[PDB]
Ligand binder design. Sequence first.
Ligand SMILES: CCN(CC)CCCCNc1ncc2cc(-c3cc(OC)cc(OC)c3)c(NC(=O)NC(C)(C)C)nc2n1
Ligand SMILES: CCN(CC)CCCCNc1ncc2cc(-c3cc(OC)cc(OC)c3)c(NC(=O)NC(C)(C)C)nc2n1
Lengths: 272, 274
Amino acid sequence: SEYELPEDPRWELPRDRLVLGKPLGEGAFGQVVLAEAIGLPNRVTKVAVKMLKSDATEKDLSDLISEMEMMKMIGKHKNIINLLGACTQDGPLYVIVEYASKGNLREYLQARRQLSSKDLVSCAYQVARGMEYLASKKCIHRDLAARNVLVTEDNVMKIADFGLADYYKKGRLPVKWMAPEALFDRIYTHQSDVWSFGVLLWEIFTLGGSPYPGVPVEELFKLLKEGHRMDKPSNCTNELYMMMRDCWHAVPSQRPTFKQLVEDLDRIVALT
Amino acid sequence: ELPEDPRWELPRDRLVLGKPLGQVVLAEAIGLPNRVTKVAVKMLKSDATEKDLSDLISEMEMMKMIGKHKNIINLLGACTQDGPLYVIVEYASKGNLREYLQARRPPQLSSKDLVSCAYQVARGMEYLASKKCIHRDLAARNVLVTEDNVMKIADFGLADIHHIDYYKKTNGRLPVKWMAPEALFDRIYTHQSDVWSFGVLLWEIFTLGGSPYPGVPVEELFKLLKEGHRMDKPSNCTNELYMMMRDCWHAVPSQRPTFKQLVEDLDRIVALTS
Ligand SMILES: CCN(CC)CCCCNc1ncc2cc(-c3cc(OC)cc(OC)c3)c(NC(=O)NC(C)(C)C)nc2n1
Ligand SMILES: CCN(CC)CCCCNc1ncc2cc(-c3cc(OC)cc(OC)c3)c(NC(=O)NC(C)(C)C)nc2n1
């Protein structure tokens, strides 16, 4: 709201206990910066702080608040970027979350082209867990992709942007991750996230590969309508490839659920 | 108007014309005395211009000079006198290599079959290279397969690089996707740019008739090419053959291997292939 944000003692962290740092990046909404929180009672923890940019509007604030509240409703899980604290009173809002020192999975996977066969499946399993969790919390990500997966210093995959309140905007095209029903019928479901997870799996087995390179939107919709499915990556069992194709099944009910995926991948990680 | 040639002429009555292939028609040639041989016959259309008759003759004369080789569609004869020009060439019952490959995809060909298929193409190309012939459109579509599974390169002596339409499709594909960057941008065609094309063809063998750059339009293809993009390794294909593919797509023309080299490597791999 305009003059003062709602109070919640549970999450509030005294601004003096937070020391803002080197910005991690930015976007339309606002801005994220590295920082150092104290006693989340006198030990410094590194965190990422999201906040509004100086050109923000009441709605931009309203979106950052909604994003914080949603993270609050959802709850904690090892495989998602968790809420750690918040400075809401007397000053700009600060959404304090977990810090992922190795950036998103795409960048992670490319700098290491050195992961093992178990590691690649281990990474896919952790992303499936987090999604199962978000799904058990009624959460529909709608933009699952390696970019929205962040990796910690200890290599823990963490789903990001799951609580975020132009088919041509890039520099890859996010529509390339979209389930046909969500892209044609605007039908966003937990199953559509399962489609996007397939495209993510492929990103894992191509070590940061770019899906449909050189293929513009109009062309993508055509391949989709023609039932075309990306080729099986080199270094990826026919089994893991069935899983990708499984997730890319036209009929959303026929695609596997995140719970099943977590199960299959559990097993596969063991048989790797 | 057409000069008779004792070397290749076959009496028109010896050519039992048959079913259309796609103009090329299947046909039976008696003699070539009491034996018939299945052959393919190229002839002009009804609305064929005098230019089309020039190219057709040219394609024949080019075939006459190039000589015979196991891995190319050889010339068998011609019906030039009194009537339509019939250019009788070898018959490939199993169609082109793309179809051959696709129609054998699992719901089969071995690894040695596929590697052996690349070897034969390379030999076809090598002979043609040894004879000063640059193909310009080497692709699986331009390789035909005989009943014995013999790979035969087609349309090598074909009749303008300055009149080619880039936005034209084939099965709905863009031939520019087989073109080397310098042949596409600088209009420079050499044996080397044919080597780039053989690399794309190699990629089609290992993807069982796979389409290069799905959904990628001409304008976007130039961009990938300018950025130095290279297709990914086909699944079920060695790092050694992917490497060969990669060497064929070497940015620098003078650095790509020659067909003579390709033939030596493929021959070594076939022998080692399971
Ligand atoms: C760039 C150099 N390398 C090497 C690869 C290191 C980078 C380290 C990146 N460390 C990091 N660690 C945690 C982050 C968390 C968020 C984030 C913030 C949220 O606020 C409420 C919610 C959320 O999930 C629901 C995630 C984030 N958000 C973000 O938008 N970041 C950009 C840069 C894209 C603007 N970035 C983060 N970065
Ligand atoms: C159901 C699958 N079924 C369809 C009937 C099998 C198809 C088998 C096709 N069997 C065949 N066997 C030999 C051919 C030779 C040529 C050919 C002709 C030339 O003339 C001087 C030169 C040349 O290269 C030097 C090759 C050719 N040419 C051609 O352009 N053919 C199409 C169909 C594309 C018009 N086609 C051929 N086809």
